[PDB]
Every structure is written in structure tokens, then in C-alpha cells.
Design a binder for this molecule. Sequence first.
Ligand SMILES: [Zn+2]
Ligand SMILES: [Zn+2]
Ligand SMILES: [Zn+2]
Length: 178
Amino acid sequence: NSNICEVCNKWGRLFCCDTCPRSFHEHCHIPSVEANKNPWSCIFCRIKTIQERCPESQSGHQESEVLMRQMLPEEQLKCEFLLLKVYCDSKSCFFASEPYYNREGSQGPQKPMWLNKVKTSLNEQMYTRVEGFVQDMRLIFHNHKEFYREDKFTRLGIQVQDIFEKNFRNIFAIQETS
Ligand SMILES: [Zn+2]
Ligand SMILES: [Zn+2]
Ligand SMILES: [Zn+2]
């Protein structure tokens, strides 16, 4: 097994995957690493199993169809993995915790949003469709772009949104386009 957490790249109290060499901090894994379960399989392994059981699940899909899917267990897992892939980027620190807004010439967003809030919402099964989760994720970056206007800090939102979107297209097998 790896000697650093797959998400945050730090050592510490790590839980080891039984079916792959990845390791995790308890609350870096999503969902939080389960108490018992020997063997234990991480989210990466669980996603790979989905694809192996149903190879046709990798044929291209329309985003509009994906978004209307109900959050059954497989879609729940896929959203958890997509959230985890965003946390894997170090630039996610800027969007993890509850933001505050006091900048000359800007007004804060009407609906603030952050990664830890999405994390809790997923944990508490508050999203009924994939669209719920994706809307809150995209709102994180949209709020950031609007607030930071022409400050170059706006680019952090662009960068983390790009990681989100690339991973969304990969995990949900969105049909490739030009
Ligand atoms: Zn970690
Ligand atoms: Zn694994
Ligand atoms: Zn199948």
C-alpha cells in the first residue's frame, strides 16, 4: 500500500485498500472509511467494479440524460467519487470551507456554496437527482468568478472547475464532442 493519503498526499493515520495499493485518511475518503469491513475496498475499486460488471456503461451519454438520473446507489457513488476527485486537487482548499465576502466593489453571492457543504448534503442523501449535485458544484465556481471579477484570483475557480468538468465527463461517460 501507499504510505501517503491518495487525496491530500500526506502521511498520518491511514486506512489501506484491500484491493488496490491506495491509502486514505478516514475523512479524506468519501464516504468516510467504514468502521469494520474486512476486506475493505476504496471508492476507486468500487467504481472500477461498476464498469466491469457493465462494460456498456462506458458508451457515450448525453449530459441532459445523466443529470435527470435519480440518485440510486450507483449514481450516489459516482457523485461521491467525482467530489473526491475535486478534493484530490490541492487548489480545492480554496473552496472547501464556508466562504465570506467583504471586498470593495463586489457583493457576495445570493447562494453561497462550498465543498464541505456538498459533502454533507451527499452524506445526508439530500440530492434526489444527479442534477442537484452538479448544480451545487457548478455554483461554487460561478460564485467565485462573479465575486472576484477582474482580480486574477478568479483563475482559481476556472482551474478547479476544469478538474470538476473533466472528471464529470469521465465518470459519467459523457459522449465525446468537438
Ligand atoms: Zn488525506
Ligand atoms: Zn482500492
Ligand atoms: Zn451490463
